């Protein structure tokens, strides 16, 4: 038993609510929460800067200090960091970005991060601003992640399309 509230069941592992990942990570605390992160972990917007600002930029200075040491992640890659004020941990994935012209085969390859972690608080990789289509989102997230992973969508509208297009 866990301390998520209000999600439709999509299969024996995923789920997913109409809900802003802010709002829901600081009342949850999960364990995790995934950051729809760039290489350069830099958090300009979309979750990413959304995330930043609730911690009041932490992030970022943390990001900035991760990167200064270790180099840019890959496309497809991830690193664990802080959670700061909205969970224990921060586990910043980075989708590919169509518009920047980045394989969507990496998006099984970002997805297959979240197997490392039992539970997670997480955003659909590669949509919204990173230009991916939700829907094949969706589908590679319940097709490669094995772990429990709850899924917030900050949009009614496409959560409705999404829920009512899951085969
Ligand atoms: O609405 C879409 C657009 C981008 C792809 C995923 C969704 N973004 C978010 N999802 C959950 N919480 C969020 N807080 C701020 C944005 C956000």
């Given at each position: 038993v866990n301390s998520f509230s209000g999600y439709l069941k999509l299969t024996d592992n995923v789920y997913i609510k109409n809900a802003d990942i802010v709002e829901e990570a600081k009342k949850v605390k999960p364990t995790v929460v995934v950051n729809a992160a760039n290489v350069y972990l830099k958090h300009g917007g979309g979750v990413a800067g959304a995330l930043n600002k609730a911690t009041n930029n932490a992030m970022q200075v943390e990001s900035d200090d991760y990167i200064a040491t270790n180099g840019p992640?890959?496309?497809?890659?991830?690193?664990?960091?802080?959670?700061?004020?909205?969970?224990?941990?921060?586990?910043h994935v980075v989708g590919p970005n169509?518009?920047?012209?980045?394989?969507?085969?990496?998006?099984?390859?970002?997805?297959?991060?979240?197997?490392?972690?039992e539970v997670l608080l997480a955003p659909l990789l590669s949509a919204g601003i990173f230009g991916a289509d939700p829907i094949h989102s969706l589908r590679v997230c319940v097709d490669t992640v094995r772990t429990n992973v709850y899924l917030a969508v900050f949009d009614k509208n496409l959560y409705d399309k999404l829920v009512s297009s899951f085969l």
């Open positions: 992640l890959k496309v497809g890659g991830s690193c664990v960091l802080s959670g700061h004020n909205l969970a224990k941990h921060c586990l169509v518009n920047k012209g980045e394989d969507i085969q990496l998006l099984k390859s970002a997805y297959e991060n979240f197997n490392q972690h």
